[PDB]
């Protein structure tokens, strides 16, 4: 069905050089809840977007990649500093990899009791990452919306492909409501998300970290529930 399972995660391929990574944590009350991110191929290199839950499932992605790509992880971006996004910090360092955040997410990571990445990304007044700070991102097009989900959220278009990645800020167009919002910000929510639209307006194939990929309905869906919010 496209997802191959390994240990305790799934991976299915997106495009040529991109796959998805889920990982599931329980919640008490919701289940195992998957969490997505990916991993894109940039030539002789591999960029990863966000962690699993947890130090061993980010080992795990690793692994994954060793066994089905066989090339060195340059570096990782993780999207902003909830336990989905960057719990698995730790083993990205224990394996030597170069990590990125929104400077904001590396302010909040240790109250979150996440572990903050080794730099820290700056964005511009229209969004856009400056791109000083944002070195050998490749195809990587990382884009800060406005706060929504969370203050620090940020969003990564891959060039080359059809694909952005909106991380916990897009719901799938089916969706019954916007997930946790407890970090949320309800007055730009519905900004933020078109936003991000505008930002990758050519981007057909949507991911997203707790729905499977989708058409852009995903981003009109989204911003029309946080139309509510307000
Ligand atoms: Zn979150
Ligand atoms: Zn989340």
């Not at 009350?29 to 191929?41: D, E, K, P, Y």
């Not at 066989?70 to 960057?86: E, S």
């Not at 730099?119 to 097009?141: I, Q």
């Not at 990382?142 to 990645?165: C, E, K, L, M, Q």
Request: charged residues 15%.
């Amino acid at each position: 069905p496209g997802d191959q399972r390994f240990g305790d995660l799934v991976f299915r391929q997106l495009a040529p050089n991109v796959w998805q990574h889920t990982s599931y944590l329980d919640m008490p009350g919701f289940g195992a809840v998957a969490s997505n991110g990916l991993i894109v191929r940039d030539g002789g290199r591999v960029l990863v977007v966000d962690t699993a839950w947890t130090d061993d499932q980010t080992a795990q992605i690793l692994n994954w990649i060793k066994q089905e790509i066989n090339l060195p992880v340059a570096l990782a971006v993780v999207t902003h500093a909830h336990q989905d996004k960057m719990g698995g910090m730790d083993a990205l360092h224990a394996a030597g990899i170069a990590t990125y955040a929104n400077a904001l997410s590396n302010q909040l990571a240790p109250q979150e009791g996440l572990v903050a990445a080794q730099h820290s990304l700056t964005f511009a007044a229209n969004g856009w990452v400056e791109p000083a700070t944002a070195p050998n991102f490749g195809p990587l097009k990382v884009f800060y919306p406005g706060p929504g989900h969370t203050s620090d959220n940020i969003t990564v278009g891959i060039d080359g492909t059809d694909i952005a990645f909106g991380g916990c800020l897009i719901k799938d167009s089916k969706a019954k409501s916007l997930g946790n919002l407890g970090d949320a910000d309800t007055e730009h929510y519905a900004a933020s998300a078109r936003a991000f639209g505008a930002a990758f307006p050519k981007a057909s194939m949507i991911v997203m970290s707790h729905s499977a990929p989708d058409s852009r309905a995903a981003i009109t869906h989204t911003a029309r529930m946080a139309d509510k919010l307000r």
